[PDB]
Amino acid sequence: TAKITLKTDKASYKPGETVNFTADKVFNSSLIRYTHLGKVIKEETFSGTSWSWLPPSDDFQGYMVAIYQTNTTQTILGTVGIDVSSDWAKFPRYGFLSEFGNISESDRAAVIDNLKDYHINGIQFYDWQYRQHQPLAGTVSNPMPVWNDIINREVYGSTVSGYIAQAHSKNMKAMFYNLAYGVLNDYDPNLIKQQQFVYKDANHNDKDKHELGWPFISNIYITDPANTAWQNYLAQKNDDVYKVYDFDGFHIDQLGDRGNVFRYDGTNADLKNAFPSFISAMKSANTNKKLVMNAVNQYGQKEIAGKELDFLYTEVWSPNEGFKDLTQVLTDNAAYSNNSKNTVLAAYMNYNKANNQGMFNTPGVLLTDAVIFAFGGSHLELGEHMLGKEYFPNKNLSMSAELKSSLLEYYDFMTAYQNLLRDGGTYTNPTIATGDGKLNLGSWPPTMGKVAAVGKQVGSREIIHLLNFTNANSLNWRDTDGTQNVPDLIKQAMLNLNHSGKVTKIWYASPDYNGGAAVELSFSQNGEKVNFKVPVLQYWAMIVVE
């Protein structure tokens, strides 16, 4: 629907770094407007397809840039969000890579550039590694140029390093996947002793294992993350990696709750309580390297939320299948971290559908990211393709050109307005009411048939999110079979808001309307009672009262 595709050269920008813009088209009588939280901070003539802007230098600030044509009113031509951050961890927008074979440099560039346009600021390299117990193939002095992975696919070192370089060139961090504790059947028993493993019983008979059939090479066997011999072994493995591949850090994965399992000596392995010492030991060994750890279905989250992790990560499973279950994870993560850490959700959309070639269900994907983004979360979902399954190379489902377009606007939006979405504040219930019957308004958690209003006091602003369940035919976020409805647009819906405190300005932004650029609304205020009209509600509208 946008006339123009507006992009920048990098995914994000440290303070003092220049932003280089490309537009695909030029139009006459147009203006580039730079906004910070809805306020114009610069305008200039739209003059060509390529120009630059040096952003203000305050750290951790999101901006929107919007090109307008003047009609003999103004029409939005297209938008881009910009993130000024010194470091990804405050506002993580996490993506993946999953294929590391003989892939050309231009093919790799097209992958990274596309991730760059979603402002992805870090990438989890998934199944890059040789083995869980030896991520580096070969030696530091003599690294193997080609190896085979857990599915016996070829991985090229030069593809790994090439993607690390390309990610770096776009201001993205590179995080190497491995398990915290994983060992395959070709490990060296001289190095990883019996004493190190986790067992299904007290008599060190049977080792705990995640069973994998063909074409996987091995079951994943399981060590004690608290075991210091294990820790020192794996620190050496990590160091080797770092000396060969210039990863910024270690994305620590695990298999989630193993139920009731045991150490060599018969004591409860209680793995959630073993992770803290593991994380500390990994950080201690490579103090310059970042750590993120997957609390699978929250297993370990409370125990690890206080440790040296850049931000928190949760892979979401049953029984956390409701929209209200994703916000419970986000609320619990804030509480476990004492409001220190934001969260990334791994939450694989259209999961059952992804048993076969097909399309992602656009409305299910968008409704999901609306809830996630609106509540200050982030979704790990984009790499070479979008995730349909926990096995990231699975690319059975494609994104329509419409979904691609739309999701770019959703990433623009959660970037531009990060300062409002996930940079402090308190959730409140706004006292709001339809003025014209056009909205059937409720609170959070949501109700099918209703628009849910979510309030956040963020410094001196009042934020109101409208999240549209009017046409929802389920409240399960995964939309596993791709059945979720596209919501009908609601237009020009009058809202009544109690707000004591003089209102100065009210503004609207939605990723569904005008590329998420701020629109100032008309309003009246009669003592406490404030009215105004929202232009368009489809999935997700944000109202901001200053």
Author numbering: 39 to 110, 113 to 586
From the paper:
Earlier, we identified dextranase (FjDex31A) and kojibiose hydrolase (FjGH65A) in the dextran utilization locus (FjDexUL) of a soil Bacteroidota Flavobacterium johnsoniae and hypothesized that FjDexUL is involved in the degradation of α-(1→2)-branched dextran. FjDexUL consists of eight genes that encode proteins Fjoh_4428–Fjoh_4435: SusR homolog (Fjoh_4435, hereafter FjDusR), SusC homolog (Fjoh_4434, FjDusC), SusD homolog (Fjoh_4433, FjDusD), SusE/F homolog (Fjoh_4432, FjDusE), GH66 enzyme (Fjoh_4431, FjGH66), GH31 dextranase (Fjoh_4430, FjDex31A), GH97 enzyme (Fjoh_4429, FjGH97A), and GH65 kojibiose hydrolase (Fjoh_4428, FjGH65A). FjDexUL glycoside hydrolases synergistically degraded S-32 α-glucan. Collectively, FjDexUL proteins are suggested to be involved in the degradation of α-(1→2)- and α-(1→3)-branched dextrans.
To elucidate the molecular mechanism of substrate recognition, the crystal structures of FjGH66 in an unliganded form and complexes with glucose, IG2, or IG3 were determined at 1.18 to 1.85 Å resolution. All crystals, except the IG3 complex, belong to the space group C2, and the space group of the IG3 complex is P212121. The overall structures are almost identical (root mean squared deviation of 0.304 < Cα ≤ 0.472 Å); therefore, the following descriptions are based primarily on IG3-complex structure at 1.18 Å resolution. The conformations of Lys429 are identical between the ligand-free and IG3 complex structures (not shown). The crystal structure of FjGH66 shows that some sugar-binding subsites can accommodate α-(1→2)- and α-(1→3)-branches. Enzymatic and structural analyses of FjGH66 revealed that FjGH66 accommodates α-(1→2)- or α-(1→3)-branches at all subsites except subsites −1 and −2.
